Design a protein around this ligand. Sequence first.
Ligand SMILES: *Cc1c(COP(=O)(O)O)cnc(C)c1O
Ligand SMILES: *Cc1c(COP(=O)(O)O)cnc(C)c1O
Lengths: 366, 366
Amino acid sequence: MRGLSRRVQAMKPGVDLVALTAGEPDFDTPEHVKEAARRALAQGKTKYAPPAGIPELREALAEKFRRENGLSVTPEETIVTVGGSQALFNLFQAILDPGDEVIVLSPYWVSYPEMVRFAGGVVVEVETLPEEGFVPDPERVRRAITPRTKALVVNSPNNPTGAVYPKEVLEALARLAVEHDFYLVSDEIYEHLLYEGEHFSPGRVAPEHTLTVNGAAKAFAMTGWRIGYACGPKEVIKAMASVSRQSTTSPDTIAQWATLEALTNQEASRAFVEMAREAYRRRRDLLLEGLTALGLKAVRPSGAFYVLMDTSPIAPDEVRAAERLLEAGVAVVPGTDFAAFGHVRLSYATSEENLRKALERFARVL
Amino acid sequence: MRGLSRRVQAMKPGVDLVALTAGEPDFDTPEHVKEAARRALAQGKTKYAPPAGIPELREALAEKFRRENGLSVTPEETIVTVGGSQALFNLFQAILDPGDEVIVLSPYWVSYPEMVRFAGGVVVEVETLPEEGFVPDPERVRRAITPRTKALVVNSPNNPTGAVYPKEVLEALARLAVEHDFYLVSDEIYEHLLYEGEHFSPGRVAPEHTLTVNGAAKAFAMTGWRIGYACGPKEVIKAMASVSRQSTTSPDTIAQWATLEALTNQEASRAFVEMAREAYRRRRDLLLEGLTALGLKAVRPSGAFYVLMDTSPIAPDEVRAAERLLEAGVAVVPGTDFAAFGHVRLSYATSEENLRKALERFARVL
Ligand SMILES: *Cc1c(COP(=O)(O)O)cnc(C)c1O
Ligand SMILES: *Cc1c(COP(=O)(O)O)cnc(C)c1O
């Protein structure tokens, strides 16, 4: 018989426009990384790499996680994947049996529920409130815990809210994982795009319960390179490598060598990060002041490069709001898929010039 | 609770040695491809690409499948993946429900049964015979079809046997798919590594039943670049792209542009293919001559760069034979995992000098 599988069928799908929809940096990847790619090419590093990644990168990864995040991990508790998205996908395929529950915090990144469902898992949503700065209340999270809870996904700095969760909240969530015996999945890819506060990694207190996901995509403007990395309990990392072996085999070898340079040349990478960070902060401040002057509401973000804007004054719902803004000349992302109803996601990974235009057009819509 | 999933737990795991174990070309990727990669880097083509691949590549793919294989496909019935392995992985995830049966022809590439079972499928094995040159008998296949058959996997040129199936057998297999209504998965990555006969794509006789899987890996010495491609029914291709979107997002952008060059610069690419084909042919003959002189049995391959050697004269079984050979100084791959019992896979993707060195050491295990 022909026909698609159930898992795949259950899956969810001359005008001048100013686009504020980007999910990737506007900067190009820094030259030290590009140069390392060039050396790898000339050195013929074009062969298959091990499923978990070239050993040199795994070693550098163990250093980064300990040095930057205070995580006590060995090279064997580290894995290189085809983007942070594959680290999350392999993780769910490795820990979820049909019916296992995963607590997700809304608004959430679009891919989380999809990946959980694709593995046969059940999504259990816990909402974070705009009035609480989109920071989870551990008390609301406890109520979502059942005997079937397998994992809890935390994403700070957050996409799409831009919220940075305080260490006390993160410690409280790590404690629930330990007390109730489940995995804490910490998506930390925006760690370096932080304007205020500190980036705390829950793996610092509960390493055997925490799976830390990260990558080069957002920090080093390497979205198209497809290199992500994770660390955590040795047995889970081993299982994740098994999934890669039977799907992608291993990430692009040239990209792995280029990523090694981003991690080892701390001086050049630090210079890129500080430059981008300062640019993003100026853009964020520019946007927020403008929105406030218009009377539009948005919780001030402390990280990433997104702003969730309440659309109540523009239309009855976020899709109608998004279509009106489109007519006005501004492309925004409706909050529907992120479970951010009544909001629209704005991205400031564009020029100040474009942010000014967009504010002019919002003005006209009001 | 914590713990690994069943699908992951069910998964199967001073000496001078000459290695005849390679599953990739010894040649480095051609300069024109490397140059295309440098241009993309210089041009800032480092951003996210669409889930099915950059439009330029999907169009070049349509041309390739039409031109080289006589397949009539549009760019939309084309998909780019992270290696041909991901094409197969996404395919099974997109077409298999737990319990669905997939017919595989032994000896088979190690990854087929693992990919089938990971998606919940049941592996039904149909044996090909040494006496029949490892070419399948359509009758034996017919005898394996049940109401639960979802697909039949065919790989020609074959890994690990090196057999090239005649157009007439490929047509008979396609007909069974059309006759019994199931998918025909054609793994054609070794099409350009052919020494005698001609490559026939069964998608020509059963377009709506066939998924043609291919890639740049073996033909252009690009195993580490991780770029594969497939074509087939629009609805299946669309479903495969959906799997990519929630797992890898899209293959590395730099590698996609480099692959476009390998497909469009026909003059430089054919020069490489013909150069490699010539070298492989030399190495094959040399290896076969040597074995024959040693009194060792092996079926003469017409494609790829492998030879399945009968280990009867060496040890009771192929694992023991592989161990004796190791002591003798030659590393070979036991036929165990390919369901090629009593055999050992030899790869001639190495220099003639190494092949000569191995043949010399073979004298010690008689
Ligand atoms: C970008 C992103 C990732 C991973 O991106 P990759 O490009 O696959 O590395 C993971 N989580 C969030 C919230 C992201 O925004
Ligand atoms: C090498 C190979 C593939 C695909 O390899 P990729 O490196 O993932 O492109 C598929 N089938 C067979 C039989 C192979 O030998």
